[PDB]
Amino acid sequence: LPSIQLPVDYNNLFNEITDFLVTFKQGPKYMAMLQKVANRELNSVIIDLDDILQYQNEKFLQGTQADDLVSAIQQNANHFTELFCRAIDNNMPLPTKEIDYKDDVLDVILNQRRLRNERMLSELFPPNLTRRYFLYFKPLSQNCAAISSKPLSVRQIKGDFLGQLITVRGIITRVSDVKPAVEVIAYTCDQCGYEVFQEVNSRTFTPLSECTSEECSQNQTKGQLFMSTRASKFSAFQECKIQELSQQVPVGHIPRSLNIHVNGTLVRSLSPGDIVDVTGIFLPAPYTGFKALKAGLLTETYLEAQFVRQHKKKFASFSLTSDVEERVMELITSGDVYNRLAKSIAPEIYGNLDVKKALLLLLVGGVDKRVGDGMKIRGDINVCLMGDPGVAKSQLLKAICKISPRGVYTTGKGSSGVGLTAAVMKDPVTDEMILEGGALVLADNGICCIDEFDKMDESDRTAIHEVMEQQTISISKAGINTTLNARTSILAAANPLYGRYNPRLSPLDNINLPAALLSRFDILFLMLDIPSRDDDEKLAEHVTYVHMHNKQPDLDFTPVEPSKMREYIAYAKTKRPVMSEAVNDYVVQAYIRLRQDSKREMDSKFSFGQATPRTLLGIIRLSQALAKLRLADMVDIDDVEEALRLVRVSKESLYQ
């Protein structure tokens, strides 16, 4: 009933929008996109607010006043999706190329309807019915920066923000599968042969049932309406949920969450377990009909997604733009990348260089193989660290957990073999049975870190056997019978029996693992804490420096930063280097010697069990990883001898 004044007039802002779309350039930037839309080449338009800020600054420096459109579309974001769409529809250019127009049902229907009106004469339909494109806003760069550039945790999203454009940081908990949602519905009248349309915005609607057209009415033609899919307009819909990071929850509270909606080409971007910076519009969800009359003033709410930024680029997302090319050329031209990359893993830890080199080869991994008859062979590498207390095992393990784009960390005592693999939970109130994957599934195509491996129960450790070699999980339980994919490499850490390693016994007595499991690791590294006045002094001088400066001590060596390291590793995981006959003869001859030496010494104090055929393929996998890191397309004997050295060094700790 009443009315107020406000500082904003939308006519001025509409004029600014139509100038911006036809003038801005880094021809003008957005007219190329609209030409691609007109050619049917492109389905969505992404508006950059950095452009609008730049445009405002340039117009100001030319000595003229202008409205602050950037804050104006952040404060009340919902309304401007319509203004930009009307401007785009007004200014859309004509096609540059032939289209085959007759493929469109709506074109035929509207052409015939226009012809009917033309004959009869001897808005027509809602404009939403012919918008072939989607439109989204991208928030301000924080380095140019405003609230949309600054991430909020899910607790900080108060009721003040309803209507605004914001950014949210958290973990995704669940994702729905895609289904269609109506936008414009189409009907046919039987007796008078005429078509009518209805537009849907709310969660529910009543379909039409009477032909209220004036011509039909004046012919007293009370015809029947029928619905049609073939000329209705749908859009893809998906719903998700986001939840705050566990390390940001205040003490004694339960974590909170938000509902996310996604439409258009942005669909199936999110996935469960992702850590992500989502940005969008935060809105209420009104009730409808009789429910609204007795629901009260408490409103449900949700987030309309507009753009999504991931924290770590998955290795599958790689493509060699020249921006990346220029950076990998730095490492390639500098040379000796193997040592530099290994030295760059956890620089705050002194020494341990061979362990770091082994863990770099774990990050790269071997080549997947699939024979013409259907047999397949594991490409992943498995590694284990066995050693005394206080030698940085947990610390080094947790450092590698940062580099990998997909990975999880777990400890032996806190873990169930079920929850480690996959569980059949009677989760809903409806008594339904549903399968939910465990840690080894969440680490699919990544690394799984298992600390305190010696504390985990002997029965529960057997769950890992199938995943380690076959990279799959098989379940046959109440109402569920399926196989899941688990393409994951395992890294584990343990103390020997009795804690500190005991020289009175053999290595196998100290290790205390069964034969079938000890074989599934490609490398097991044995590391012992033996005092030395000389080495202890150097280690202490290094650690004390680190505590003093927060920096590793350096005179010669500069580590590569983790980002450039990820780019190099991601580029290196694409190569698939092949073997050759000269190399094959050498490794074939090496394998015989290993088994003969094992047979000779099964009695001996220097025994470590017997070399199985899985030790041959371990050599091939390590060799191929080394070939990948030098960006080759061919394994070289130089790789094989290093792969043998790296296996030999694991046992030298036994000899003080």
């Binding site: 009933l1 009443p2 009315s3 107020i4 004044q5 406000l6 500082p7 904003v8 404060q75 009340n76 974001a77 009721g159 003040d160 309803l162 209507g163 566990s246 003490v251 004694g252 909170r256 209420p284 609204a292 009359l293 009260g296 003033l297 408490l298 409103t299 709410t301 620089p347 207390p389 206080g390 030698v391 940085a392 610390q395 940062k402 777990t410 400890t411 005592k413 806190g414 873990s415 169930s416 079920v418 929850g419 465990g438 840690a439 305190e452 504390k455 009795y498 500190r500 005092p531 030395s532 006045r533 202890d536 280690l539 202490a540 004390t544 420096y545 680190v546 505590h547 927060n550 983790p562």
Partner: protein, 613 residues
């Protein structure tokens, strides 16, 4: 109607007379106006109910007996005062029509209206009351609509409307249907302007009488409270709290036609006006405290004074007292630029004969640390001590609850092997991680551990190895910074001294009591708590080359020289030296660690480790 204006005038006279409230309005406004140009303070003021009594008794009793007729005009007058004071020009669209007035809160002298949930009675309805109890439940936060704004497409005019519900206002009005208008009076189609509309936060809680007051094992009684705007989420379950607000009734009570024959009663609530906690830990320093703390720190031997003032009722064990003081101060926690973490908190273990004050000394820490949890070793399971699953929801254990605090474990030797191994992560990585059916999560647990145990043979046997006397694995003993062995060696003068000491202790009488009625210098514990709090917040000592020169030499000699030492020596021993030196420098309020601190830390570790100084 006319009476509303006069009440606004009379409260304006009060606000002009008692000027300390104008300063409050103005200071909040200028603070908010400053940082807006770059957190924000709420538009709320607390008035002393005594000032209002001395100013006008007729207004005082009106607020206190008829709040629905006196609180609204008073609050209106406060908003006019804040609005007439100068404010930033050219407000934005949302600021122009925020629908956000200032709000009141009260303190002091409620008299007869200070109550508890058991005694709140139908006579007190519509009065302003104060209640005390324990929070038991809290709802989720929800937004609530109060105003909406609409733009008319053809005419270019902005329209608006307001909404009400029975819990939003002290006075009573016709309820509103929560519908959005789609069309103008003149037939123009409307659009809704989110971001210009106004929504507020809402939360319901429940408060119950304290269990100490429950009669005869009878059922306890409780009330529901309504909170909104600024008051949301300032409490959690288990809090002891005192709430101020108006006590009111709701609904039709079955007189709107029902099957009950109207035997059922009306519903009732308290509308939260102000909330205060109860202490049942933290203290806030006055200026004089800063002066005294800084002056005392320049004595020659502050460490001796402070350490001997811990548990003066316990004779002997000087070194354990010094170790506990350094534990309460702690080291400095490091986070490196690559995300790597280096531990800061000190863990202590003590093992010894029966009756040698182990449990008695362990009990003292629980009553001087700001956050402390206590448990017996056999009364706790691995999951209960770290974390457990429920319904999926994950529930914290004792080590997760004391995050930045200390945890005390008595009868540590009785804990089973299956329970002990759950602790190996928490004492170094300072986290808890679970991987069970339907759950994977990491939790933080940053505390310091102090614990007591009995040796294997019931008394310590010097004629057998320390490993034979102490049945724990080497990987666990390595995680304790200081390991103390203590025994009851029989000697004449020692026995005489201790016995005379405990007899002098048992002859104490508290100050306010006649004899037989039932109930160097030492700083008082209430001052020592302030000293520890100040030192832990305001000083962060950085390491120096002179300290490092001592630390490196001591570590390499101690590790390499062959001796009958009672604990394994590893890379973690070096960190214990750095932590102890940093904590001693912090006692001294020094901005940097010096050679003296490193020397003292070495002389403490040598005593505990090699048994002799």
């Amino acid at each position: 109607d006319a009476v509303f204006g006069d009440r606004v005038r009379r409260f304006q006279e009060f606000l002009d007379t008692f000027t300390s409230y104008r300063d409050s309005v103005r200071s909040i406004q200028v603070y908010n106006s400053n940082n807006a140009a770059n957190n924000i303070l709420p538009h709320r003021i607390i008035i002393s109910l005594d000032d209002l009594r001395e100013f006008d008794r007729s207004f005082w009793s009106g607020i206190l007996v008829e709040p629905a007729y006196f609180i609204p005009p008073a609050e209106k007058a406060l908003t006019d005062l804040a609005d007439s004071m100068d404010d930033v020009p050219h407000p934005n669209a949302s600021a122009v029509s925020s629908r956000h007035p200032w709000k009141l809160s009260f303190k002091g002298s409620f008299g007869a209206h200070a109550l508890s949930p058991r005694t709140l009675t139908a006579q007190h309805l519509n009065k302003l009351v104060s209640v005390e109890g324990i929070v038991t439940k809290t709802s989720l936060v929800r937004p609530k609509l109060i105003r909406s704004v609409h733009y008319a497409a053809k005419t270019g005019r902005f329209h608006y409307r307001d909404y009400t519900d029975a819990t939003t206002t002290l006075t009573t009005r016709i309820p509103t249907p929560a519908i959005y208008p789609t069309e103008d009076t003149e037939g123009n189609k409307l659009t809704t302007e989110y971001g210009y509309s106004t929504f507020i936060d809402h939360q319901r809680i429940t408060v119950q009488e304290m269990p100490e007051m429950a009669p005869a094992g009878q059922l306890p009684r409780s009330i529901d409270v309504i909170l909104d705007d600024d008051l949301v989420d300032k409490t959690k379950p288990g809090d002891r709290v005192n709430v101020v607000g108006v006590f009111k009734s709701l609904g039709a009570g079955g007189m709107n036609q029902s099957n009950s024959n109207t035997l059922i009663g009306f519903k009732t609530l308290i509308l939260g006006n102000t909330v205060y906690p109860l202490h049942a830990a933290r203290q806030m320093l006055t200026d004089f405290d800063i002066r005294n703390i800084n002056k005392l720190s320049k004595k020659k031997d502050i460490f001796d004074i402070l350490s001997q003032s811990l548990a003066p009722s316990i004779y002997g064990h000087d070194h354990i007292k010094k170790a506990i003081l350094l534990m309460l101060m702690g080291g400095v926690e490091k986070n490196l630029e690559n995300g790597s973490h280096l531990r800061g908190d000190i863990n202590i273990l003590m093992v010894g004969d029966p009756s040698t004050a182990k449990s008695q000394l362990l009990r003292f820490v629980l009553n001087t640390a700001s956050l402390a949890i206590a448990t017996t070793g056999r009364g706790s399971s691995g999951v209960g001590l770290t974390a457990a699953v429920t319904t999926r929801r994950l529930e914290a254990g004792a080590m997760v609850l004391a995050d930045r605090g200390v945890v005390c474990i008595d009868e540590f030797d009785k804990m089973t092997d299956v329970d002990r191994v759950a602790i190996h992560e928490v004492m170094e990585q300072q986290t808890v991680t679970i991987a069970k059916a339907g759950i994977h999560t990491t939790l933080n647990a940053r505390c310091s551990v102090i614990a007591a145990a009995n040796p294997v043979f019931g008394q310590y046997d010097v004629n057998r190895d320390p490993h034979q006397n102490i049945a724990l694995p080497d990987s666990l003993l390595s995680r304790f910074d200081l390991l103390f062995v203590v025994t009851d060696d029989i000697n004449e003068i020692r026995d005489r001294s201790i016995s005379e000491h405990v007899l002098r202790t048992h002859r104490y009488l508290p100050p306010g009591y006649l004899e037989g009625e039932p109930v160097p210098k030492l700083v008082t514990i209430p001052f020592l708590r302030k000293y520890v709090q100040y030192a832990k917040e305001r000083v962060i000592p950085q390491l120096t080359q002179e300290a490092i020169n001592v630390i490196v030499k001591n570590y390499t000699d101690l590790r390499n020289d062959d001796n009958t030492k009672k604990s394994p020596i590893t890379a973690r021993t070096l960190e214990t030296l750095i932590r102890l030196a940093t904590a001693h420098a912090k006692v001294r309020l020094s901005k940097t660690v010096n050679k003296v601190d490193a020397k003292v830390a070495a002389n403490l570790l040598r005593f505990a480790l090699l048994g002799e100084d």
